[PDB]
Amino acid sequence: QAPILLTNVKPVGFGKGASQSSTDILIGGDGKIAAVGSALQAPADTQRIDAAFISPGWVDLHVHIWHGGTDISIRPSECGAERGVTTLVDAGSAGEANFHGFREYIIEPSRERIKAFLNLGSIGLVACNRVPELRDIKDIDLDRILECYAENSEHIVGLKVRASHVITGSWGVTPVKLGKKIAKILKVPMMVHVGEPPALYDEVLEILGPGDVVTHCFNGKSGSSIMEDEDLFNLAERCEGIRLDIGHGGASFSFKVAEAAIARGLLPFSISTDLHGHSMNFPVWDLATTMSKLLSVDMPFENVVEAVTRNPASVIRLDMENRLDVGQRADFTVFDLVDADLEATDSNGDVSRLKRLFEPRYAVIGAEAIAASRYIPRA
Amino acid sequence: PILLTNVKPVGFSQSSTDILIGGDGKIAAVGSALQAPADTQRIDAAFISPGWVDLHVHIWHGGTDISIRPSECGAERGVTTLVDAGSAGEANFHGFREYIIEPSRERIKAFLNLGSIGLVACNRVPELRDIKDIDLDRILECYAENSEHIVGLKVRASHVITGSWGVTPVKLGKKIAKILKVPMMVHVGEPPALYDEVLEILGPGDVVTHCFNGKSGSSIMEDEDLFNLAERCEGIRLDIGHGGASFSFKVAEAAIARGLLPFSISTDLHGHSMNFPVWDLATTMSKLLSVDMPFENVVEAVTRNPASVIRLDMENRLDVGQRADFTVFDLVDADLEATDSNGDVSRLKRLFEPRYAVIGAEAIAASRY
Amino acid sequence: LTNVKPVGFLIGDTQRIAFISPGWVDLHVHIWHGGTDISIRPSECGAERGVTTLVDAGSAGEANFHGFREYIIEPSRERIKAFLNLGSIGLVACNRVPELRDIKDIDLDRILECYAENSEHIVGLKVRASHVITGSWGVTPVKLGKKIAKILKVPMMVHVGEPPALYDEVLEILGPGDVVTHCFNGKSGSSIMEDEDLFNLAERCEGIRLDIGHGGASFSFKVAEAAIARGLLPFSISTDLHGHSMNFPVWDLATTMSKLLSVDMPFENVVEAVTRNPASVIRLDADFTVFDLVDARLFEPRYAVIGAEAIAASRYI
Ligand SMILES: [Zn+2]
Ligand SMILES: [Zn+2]
Ligand SMILES: [Zn+2]
Ligand SMILES: [Zn+2]
Ligand SMILES: [Zn+2]
Ligand SMILES: [Zn+2]
């Protein structure tokens, strides 16, 4: 593997003490940072220049990449490196039933770092929303979940529960409490999706605790929106440990909800694209576009980059310190923030025209440097 | 180029001959004592026939929990055509096709499951709970674009799966199979969905697996009215689904004595059935030979019969130009203990012994599990 | 009346100046306005559309037929009859809240009671045998429906649809006088042109009446052609006119009549399957409907005459 020299990059999203000024980075054939400085010299190696931003590889904490195994999932190549995303976290596409399938077909052969939230339900998302995975307790197998996690602690970062009547139907919070019980036993975080009331947003925040994650935090749907209920809003703002995740995905993101939230100081902990076969082409295009929508409703730049690197990484226990150090395995994402006039639409059909766009250029994993680019809607 | 020498053809008549297979994997010549030039030669002593077919197996290795890899019940076991029995429903059929069908050496066919989630979590999370598990539309769509892979619909009709639902699912399954103009393989088990009723819905071409089980409520020997209906059922194929609960020497020996033999001999192979009850298709063949089903008859139940169900052409296989596809096996004398899905043990005095599986220009060494 | 051409067979003024037949009858409509979410007003289909005989297809069950009776039947001009739904709640929340979910939905004693009390209103029992309504129990509510209707001496209108409750299986239960609605639907699993066996059973079923339940998804031109152009033609032309079908696919009874004329059904049979035939189902025999097939060919309601009362009929827009 030949070494690489990335020249003219502007380090962002690293330590609080990382120089923001332009630099050059040298990657060794072993995919490790050989040097970092104002103008290094190199042997016979791929030299790439830009003009700008470089940060640790983007982490999309919420995707569905159980391609083939489930019906709703996409491929990691469709939302990964070619997009500037280095770490992908499948969000409960697989349960204990076919996780070994996910590991062998999706995790092991992928060039990106792939972690997964194990679904509380056994059948995961094979027939997503058509044949609910948490229809009752026969769908939950605690012993097999414990068995599954023990054999895949290197891959499974927590449990997922979709607390919404479309999935859980009529028994609401029970599965969430059960979820919390097993998560506590496994000593792992819990990511909970909120939607159509029956298994109320308010109830979930109550049972959750430090490190837990609520995805779809800023959905603008009746019965789940934090802006229609001041009591809910006050609780979300109070819930002090609980991670709020955008998980934008066709029905879970509203510009209006997010605007109001950010104006009141409530920022999302992490920005994610609940990307799958039905949200990729239209609503959500890619993480970059999602980062652009948050930036458009006043989330300071530095915080959006952080809600896509350091923050989601903490949830999955991904070490992201001293990443620029020599010897550290190169794991970056080169992107620009350019002026534009693009219209993107949220999960509420509301259209907004972004004036600035995160635009990934290269995703460099070790010695490999992949040409990245925003998703172009083939429709 | 491969030159199989000293093989005794069956299932195709002729006698001890030789087969030369060119590089393109097609038969170049078949005759006694052929002469070849600097190319591999495989000799023996040793029957040969079209590549064995397992009409009932469970692959879809990672998409489901019970399934096994096709390399554990395929070529190395002397089997060239595997037919997954409903491991996938419309929900995740692709994927089965991308991960299992496409990369395999053997011809891999599949019965699509009437129930969308198929056997992801086999038996634990029933696939045919209610009507919400059958998406008529998606089944037609899926088939329309996988017709070269899907050979039929599958509807496991027993309470462990269908709970308190009657033959209703079986009736629906039948209506759809007609629309798709394909056969339906039905599984019979715990009485809550009567064997006697399945046969009545089914038609010619359709298959019934677990046809010789020894479980109360679904056995053909305990009910003289059922047994009679089984033999009357003239177009309906009976397939042994020897798995972990669907075969009984007792029943077979009884049904074969009365001149009712199985149409096909399949091994309902999966995680929980490979290791103990059934081992490989070979052993199951020896099992049926053991209860008086004639040798030529056994070989046919593993080649022409199953193939006729999956519409796999098997005519003139030894001709020049035909793709090489055979199972080189022996029939040795032995005395090893084996048992059915009812614990009932038996002593096999003769055993089929896969030697090689020849698929095109590739000859893989084979053996019993 | 003058310049009227009688087909299919001056009261107390004036009479206008071209066809004329007995007031048309829609055997399948939903006019339980107000009482159900899906029903339309009795005057959005009917007199002003050239239909003097409306028949509600199970909008009401025993639980609120009385409400249908005084709010719709009595104050209305047209002759309103109705099939009582085997299911208590009826179509109060159509499809959203199924009427035949379980046996707890049928009340044999109240169905009997209800008929006894409205035998001059109710013309039969209806059953929506499809998985959208009956979920996983297919024929059970149909066999049960027949049983009740039988011991009720009235006809039964059975709607077929999504496969679960098999079209095939329904035809086997029915008897002469019974009516199958949505007969020429071109939807998967329920179409009579995707299973030679069904069409055979369809034709072979010489008693059982086939009705065109042209609703939001039950009438197909292709299916219509193939059948009607091979012998089996509809015993009666109907328009499953509800709050979601009137405004788009099946505008008015006339349009549907014209659709079943644009295929292969002769004028003689179309006009008969809108008067005599359907009338024989609700047991019917001062009352007129004048129309004039034009060019574009389609029917055009002109006038409705209900005893010294002529209304300016005119198709939907
Ligand atoms: Zn979700
Ligand atoms: Zn999701
Ligand atoms: Zn089985
Ligand atoms: Zn099986
Ligand atoms: Zn209807
Ligand atoms: Zn209707």
Side-chain angles (χ1 to χ4, degrees), chain A, chain B, chain C residues 1-221 223-317:
Chain A
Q1 296 64 60
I4 306 179
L5 174 63
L6 288 60
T7 60
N8 320 2
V9 293
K10 285 183 54 67
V12 67
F14 299 82
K16 185 70 180 60
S19 181
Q20 238 70 56
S21 73
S22 180
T23 333
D24 298 7
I25 309 177
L26 181 70
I27 316 297
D30 58 345
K32 295 180 182 177
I33 306 171
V36 181
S38 193
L40 328 172
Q41 296 66 55
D45 46 279
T46 301
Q47 296 198 174
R48 308 191 261 59
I49 179 188
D50 348 317
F53 293 129
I54 188 171
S55 69
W58 291 347
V59 180
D60 186 346
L61 183 72
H62 187 153
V63 296
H64 296 286
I65 49 184
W66 199 164
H67 171 83
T70 67
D71 69 328
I72 205 54
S73 296
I74 51 181
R75 303 174 191 269
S77 86
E78 300 180 0
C79 56
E82 190 180 0
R83 294 281 174 281
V85 187
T86 298
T87 297
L88 291 165
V89 192
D90 179 275
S93 298
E96 49 73 39
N98 66 5
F99 182 85
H100 66 291
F102 183 75
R103 188 191 58 238
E104 194 186 302
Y105 301 128
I106 310 305
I107 299 176
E108 298 162 350
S110 281
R111 39 165 159 35
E112 306 91 335
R113 182 191 317 275
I114 297 172
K115 323 265 72 170
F117 279 98
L118 192 62
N119 199 309
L120 206 216
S122 291
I123 73 171
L125 314 179
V126 248
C128 186
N129 297 331
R130 296 188 278 129
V131 180
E133 74 276 14
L134 275 180
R135 297 169 57 168
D136 49 54
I137 31 68
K138 303 207 301 295
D139 291 296
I140 302 175
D141 197 311
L142 185 159
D143 279 323
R144 283 190 174 69
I145 288 174
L146 292 193
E147 187 198 51
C148 187
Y149 179 80
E151 300 180 0
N152 307 93
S153 37
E154 333 81 71
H155 306 308
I156 298 180
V157 295
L159 292 337
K160 177 174 156 91
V161 184
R162 297 157 76 223
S164 293
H165 76 66
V166 154
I167 301 80
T168 48
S170 290
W171 71 318
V173 278
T174 304
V176 186
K177 292 211 56 54
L178 271 159
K180 186 60 189 181
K181 183 70 179 183
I182 296 161
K184 290 215 293 295
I185 290 176
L186 292 172
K187 298 186 301 171
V188 86
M190 192 184 166
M191 174 175 98
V192 198
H193 133 149
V194 308
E196 333 67 73
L200 280 160
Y201 197 146
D202 314 58
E203 283 178 319
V204 181
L205 264 35
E206 302 283 337
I207 158 79
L208 266 48
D212 278 359
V213 183
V214 167
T215 188
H216 302 331
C217 68
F218 295 154
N219 75 273
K221 298 301 185 181
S222 295
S224 32
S225 166
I226 66 168
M227 230 40 60
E228 42 161 37
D229 188 333
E230 280 284 347
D231 291 342
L232 201 222
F233 185 87
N234 299 319
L235 182 55
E237 175 182 60
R238 182 198 320 166
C239 297
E240 59 171 338
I242 286 62
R243 312 310 197 187
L244 300 186
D245 181 64
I246 247 56
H248 187 148
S252 313
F253 182 74
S254 172
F255 281 116
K256 304 189 172 176
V257 168
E259 211 195 312
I262 296 164
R264 293 223 236 155
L266 189 53
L267 264 51
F269 180 81
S270 63
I271 301 185
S272 68
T273 75
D274 169 41
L275 219 46
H276 56 66
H278 284 322
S279 63
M280 181 172 66
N281 189 74
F282 170 52
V284 192
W285 293 318
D286 46 31
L287 192 63
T289 302
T290 297
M291 297 164 71
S292 300
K293 295 181 179 167
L294 269 307
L295 188 75
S296 81
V297 286
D298 232 57
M299 199 172 157
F301 176 81
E302 277 272 8
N303 299 319
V304 173
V305 175
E306 163 180 294
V308 102
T309 53
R310 310 250 290 159
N311 289 171
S314 46
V315 180
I316 51 176
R317 291 164 195 164
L318 176 54
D319 168 53
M320 196 154 275
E321 295 307 2
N322 293 63
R323 293 278 255 223
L324 242 3
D325 274 37
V326 164
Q328 274 271 220
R329 192 198 187 210
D331 189 352
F332 317 119
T333 167
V334 181
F335 67 99
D336 273 308
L337 198 253
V338 312
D339 289 317
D341 180 54
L342 183 65
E343 287 202 309
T345 145
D346 63 10
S347 305
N348 276 323
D350 260 287
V351 167
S352 170
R353 52 174 62 278
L354 320 168
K355 300 301 190 182
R356 293 157 81 193
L357 293 173
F358 285 84
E359 212 113 340
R361 260 61 155 128
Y362 303 84
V364 195
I365 304 169
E368 206 186 314
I370 303 81
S373 164
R374 279 178 49 258
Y375 169 82
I376 306 303
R378 287 172 195 49
Chain B
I2 294 174
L3 173 61
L4 301 181
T5 60
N6 322 2
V7 296
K8 217 305 167 192
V10 295
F12 295 94
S13 300
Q14 198 180 181
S15 58
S16 183
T17 197
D18 287 17
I19 306 181
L20 175 82
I21 307 156
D24 56 15
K26 307 180 176 176
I27 292 185
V30 51
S32 38
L34 307 177
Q35 301 296 300
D39 55 295
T40 318
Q41 319 199 322
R42 315 283 179 176
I43 176 187
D44 22 58
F47 287 109
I48 183 151
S49 65
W52 294 345
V53 182
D54 209 331
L55 234 198
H56 189 150
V57 100
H58 293 289
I59 306 150
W60 204 170
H61 170 67
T64 66
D65 61 351
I66 49 154
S67 294
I68 52 181
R69 299 169 187 276
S71 75
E72 300 180 0
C73 62
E76 300 180 0
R77 294 304 143 217
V79 177
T80 291
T81 300
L82 300 158
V83 186
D84 173 84
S87 292
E90 55 74 27
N92 70 169
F93 180 68
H94 60 117
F96 169 77
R97 180 198 69 219
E98 187 179 312
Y99 302 131
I100 315 288
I101 297 179
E102 286 163 23
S104 292
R105 306 208 191 89
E106 37 286 284
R107 176 145 262 218
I108 312 282
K109 301 295 174 178
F111 274 107
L112 185 71
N113 200 316
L114 214 222
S116 298
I117 75 166
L119 316 187
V120 201
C122 192
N123 293 323
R124 304 192 291 119
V125 179
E127 77 274 12
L128 279 183
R129 285 155 155 283
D130 41 48
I131 190 48
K132 291 308 177 190
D133 287 343
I134 306 181
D135 195 315
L136 193 311
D137 299 7
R138 282 166 204 277
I139 288 166
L140 303 195
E141 197 189 15
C142 173
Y143 179 72
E145 354 180 3
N146 295 99
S147 49
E148 67 285 359
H149 303 297
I150 304 167
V151 302
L153 288 178
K154 177 174 156 91
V155 324
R156 305 190 302 166
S158 70
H159 72 58
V160 58
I161 297 123
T162 48
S164 302
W165 212 2
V167 296
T168 294
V170 182
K171 293 276 292 294
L172 290 161
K174 215 297 176 294
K175 211 294 157 56
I176 300 176
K178 286 184 181 176
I179 290 170
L180 297 188
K181 281 173 169 56
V182 60
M184 179 167 67
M185 171 171 92
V186 182
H187 128 136
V188 285
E190 318 85 70
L194 279 320
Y195 199 139
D196 324 20
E197 303 181 297
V198 168
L199 293 160
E200 279 161 45
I201 310 293
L202 265 39
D206 287 322
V207 189
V208 165
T209 327
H210 313 314
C211 65
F212 286 170
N213 78 286
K215 307 299 183 185
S216 297
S218 61
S219 185
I220 61 163
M221 289 313 281
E222 68 182 5
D223 196 303
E224 297 298 321
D225 301 81
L226 165 64
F227 189 96
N228 299 319
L229 174 72
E231 67 178 355
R232 201 254 297 174
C233 286
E234 71 171 308
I236 291 175
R237 315 299 176 190
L238 303 186
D239 164 69
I240 58 180
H242 193 123
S246 308
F247 184 73
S248 175
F249 289 109
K250 241 80 168 191
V251 183
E253 185 177 358
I256 296 295
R258 278 184 166 181
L260 178 64
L261 352 184
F263 179 69
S264 40
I265 290 175
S266 59
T267 66
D268 184 16
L269 261 171
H270 60 251
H272 300 165
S273 69
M274 176 173 269
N275 226 303
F276 172 52
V278 38
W279 288 318
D280 45 55
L281 181 60
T283 302
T284 309
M285 284 160 81
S286 313
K287 282 179 181 172
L288 276 277
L289 178 70
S290 174
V291 289
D292 219 26
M293 183 174 74
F295 176 82
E296 297 294 303
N297 260 286
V298 172
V299 165
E300 192 181 316
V302 170
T303 50
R304 317 208 82 228
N305 297 317
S308 75
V309 173
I310 66 181
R311 292 174 212 169
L312 159 50
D313 177 56
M314 215 170 250
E315 301 319 318
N316 315 305
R317 286 312 194 66
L318 290 165
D319 284 7
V320 163
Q322 286 247 165
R323 177 163 182 273
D325 189 12
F326 332 97
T327 297
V328 171
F329 72 97
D330 294 352
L331 180 63
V332 194
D333 288 300
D335 185 0
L336 66 68
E337 258 65 72
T339 179
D340 58 9
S341 57
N342 283 60
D344 300 0
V345 176
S346 176
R347 314 180 180 63
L348 307 175
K349 300 179 285 62
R350 297 146 85 195
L351 302 165
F352 288 89
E353 282 297 4
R355 303 298 171 184
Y356 311 81
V358 186
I359 301 172
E362 191 176 8
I364 310 86
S367 67
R368 202 155 46 69
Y369 181 67
Chain C
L1 288 180
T2 174
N3 128 312
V4 293
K5 309 183 186 183
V7 287
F9 295 68
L10 47 89
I11 317 82
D13 301 300
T14 182
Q15 28 65 61
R16 297 74 60 180
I17 305 80
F19 293 88
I20 182 175
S21 61
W24 296 341
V25 51
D26 203 357
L27 192 64
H28 187 158
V29 85
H30 295 290
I31 54 181
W32 195 163
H33 179 73
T36 56
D37 66 328
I38 206 62
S39 293
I40 49 178
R41 288 169 182 293
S43 65
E44 300 180 0
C45 61
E48 300 180 0
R49 305 288 119 158
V51 183
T52 70
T53 300
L54 295 175
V55 185
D56 179 274
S59 298
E62 49 80 12
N64 68 331
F65 178 78
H66 58 292
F68 180 74
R69 187 196 65 237
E70 96 167 63
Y71 290 131
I72 306 297
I73 299 182
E74 307 184 328
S76 184
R77 302 186 304 218
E78 309 75 57
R79 216 187 210 307
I80 300 185
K81 288 289 178 167
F83 276 104
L84 190 69
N85 212 311
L86 181 56
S88 309
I89 71 168
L91 316 167
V92 288
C94 212
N95 302 313
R96 286 190 285 141
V97 184
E99 342 90 54
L100 289 186
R101 304 174 72 170
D102 56 25
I103 192 52
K104 300 290 287 62
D105 283 340
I106 304 178
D107 196 313
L108 179 61
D109 184 60
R110 306 217 196 214
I111 289 173
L112 277 158
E113 275 181 282
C114 192
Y115 192 65
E117 242 158 0
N118 308 69
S119 49
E120 81 283 14
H121 292 302
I122 297 167
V123 294
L125 284 167
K126 177 174 156 91
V127 176
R128 256 137 64 73
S130 299
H131 75 64
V132 171
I133 323 82
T134 44
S136 300
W137 75 326
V139 299
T140 299
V142 192
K143 289 179 179 176
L144 222 166
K146 191 76 192 76
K147 174 77 170 185
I148 303 185
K150 171 173 294 183
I151 69 178
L152 241 191
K153 72 180 179 300
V154 87
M156 170 180 234
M157 178 179 247
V158 181
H159 125 149
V160 294
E162 314 76 72
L166 272 48
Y167 199 141
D168 316 287
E169 66 54 24
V170 165
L171 294 168
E172 76 180 300
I173 305 299
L174 272 40
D178 294 353
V179 177
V180 177
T181 205
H182 301 325
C183 72
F184 293 153
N185 75 285
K187 296 291 173 182
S188 311
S190 60
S191 180
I192 111 290
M193 287 303 294
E194 79 177 316
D195 177 3
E196 192 293 300
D197 301 356
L198 214 188
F199 183 84
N200 181 60
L201 187 58
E203 184 65 62
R204 184 68 182 179
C205 289
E206 39 82 308
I208 283 76
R209 317 301 187 182
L210 277 42
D211 172 50
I212 288 290
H214 187 154
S218 295
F219 176 78
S220 168
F221 280 125
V223 170
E225 308 169 300
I228 196 139
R230 188 179 176 181
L232 194 292
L233 61 303
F235 178 81
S236 66
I237 298 183
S238 201
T239 69
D240 181 50
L241 231 64
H242 54 252
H244 288 175
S245 63
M246 174 186 88
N247 174 276
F248 183 70
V250 44
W251 300 308
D252 37 69
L253 174 52
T255 296
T256 314
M257 290 173 85
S258 179
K259 291 182 174 181
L260 282 155
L261 186 295
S262 85
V263 284
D264 189 60
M265 182 160 65
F267 195 87
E268 189 62 0
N269 291 75
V270 171
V271 179
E272 181 189 277
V274 165
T275 57
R276 299 287 61 63
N277 298 305
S280 72
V281 188
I282 60 177
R283 320 211 208 193
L284 176 65
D285 297 72
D287 201 306
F288 303 89
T289 297
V290 293
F291 56 109
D292 185 60
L293 234 170
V294 305
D295 291 0
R297 31 65 276 168
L298 65 167
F299 291 78
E300 304 298 311
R302 284 289 138 53
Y303 292 84
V305 184
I306 306 305
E309 203 189 322
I311 300 74
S314 38
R315 45 197 284 279
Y316 185 60
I317 26 59

